[PDB]
């Protein structure tokens, strides 16, 4: 209902008011009534990095390493008006002993793009295990030979090409890996223009009908911001209306707590107005 021009006026009003932040604060963090059981089974507990960030049973990724478990969710953002779905797999920064499962997901679905929205360590703590090798070095995870063929960077992110080799069959798979390093946990990007640049890079790398694997440390805060922003941009180019609270709810229905702080939400809303006004 209503238009792009109209939703954007509505969004601006709500930022100025500000009712958008109130409604965000009132939005549920977990979808009422969705079971979270497998993630808390005894054999699975230590495969979670955070005790409070767990996948729903219904949307959790099933390992075709088979009847195993991983802290990862399917997250599909439908833009019905454009007949469009942007598939994601949203996951935590792997643990030393869950690395093998992380590469199993990438291999089972032949994901070609990985987006990592965290540094490995932050403020005295480990936020993610380094599951890829620093060249020249090479590493093995659960029957996968991983080598980093290429490294380049901007001020905000590192772009890496990786080669994944099945050690049984000798089959090879290539993956693009993007690590945004200028975006602290529980916060906003250090630079908004780099962020928008980055998100457009991600969209241009996206393969249709193939999920993009997106993670940060917990896989809900900064990933949620990124999924909202990519959704908004697909809508803007198609002159379709944008309702960021509907976008966040639809994410939260598939993985709990996406877009963690009010500051993150306020940030992505302002970026959405920014992109719209500069393309007008």
């Amino acid at each position: 209902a209503d238009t792009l021009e109209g939703s954007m006026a509505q969004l601006k009003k709500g930022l100025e008011s500000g009712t958008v932040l109130i409604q965000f604060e009132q939005l549920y963090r977990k979808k009422p009534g969705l079971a979270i059981t497998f993630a808390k089974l005894p054999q699975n507990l230590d495969k979670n990095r955070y005790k409070d960030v767990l996948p729903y049973d219904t949307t959790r990724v099933l390992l075709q390493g088979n009847e195993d478990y991983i802290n990862a969710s399917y997250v599909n953002m439908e833009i019905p008006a454009a007949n469009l779905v942007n598939k994601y797999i949203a996951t935590q920064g792997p643990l030393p002993h869950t690395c093998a499962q992380f590469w199993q997901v990438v291999w089972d679905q032949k994901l070609s793009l990985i987006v990592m929205l965290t540094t490995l360590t932050e403020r005295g703590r480990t936020k993610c295990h380094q599951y890829w090798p620093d060249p020249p070095d090479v590493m093995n995870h659960g029957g996968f030979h991983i080598q980093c063929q290429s490294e380049d960077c901007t001020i905000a992110y590192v772009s890496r090409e990786m080669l994944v080799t099945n050690t049984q069959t000798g089959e090879e798979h290539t993956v693009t890996h993007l690590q945004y390093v200028a975006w602290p946990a529980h916060g906003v990007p250090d630079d908004s223009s780099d962020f928008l640049e980055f998100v457009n890079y991600v969209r241009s790398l996206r393969v249709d009908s193939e999920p993009v694997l997106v993670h940060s440390s917990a896989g809900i805060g900064r990933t949620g911001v990124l999924v909202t922003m990519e959704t908004a941009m697909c809508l803007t180019e198609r002159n379709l209306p944008i309702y960021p609270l509907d976008i966040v709810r639809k994410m939260r229905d598939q993985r709990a707590m996406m877009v963690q702080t009010s500051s993150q939400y306020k940030f992505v809303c302002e970026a959405i107005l920014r992109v719209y006004e500069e393309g007008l």
Partner: peptide, 8 residues
Amino acid sequence: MTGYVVTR
């Protein structure tokens, strides 16, 4: 495990 839930 530390908790990832914060305030702000």
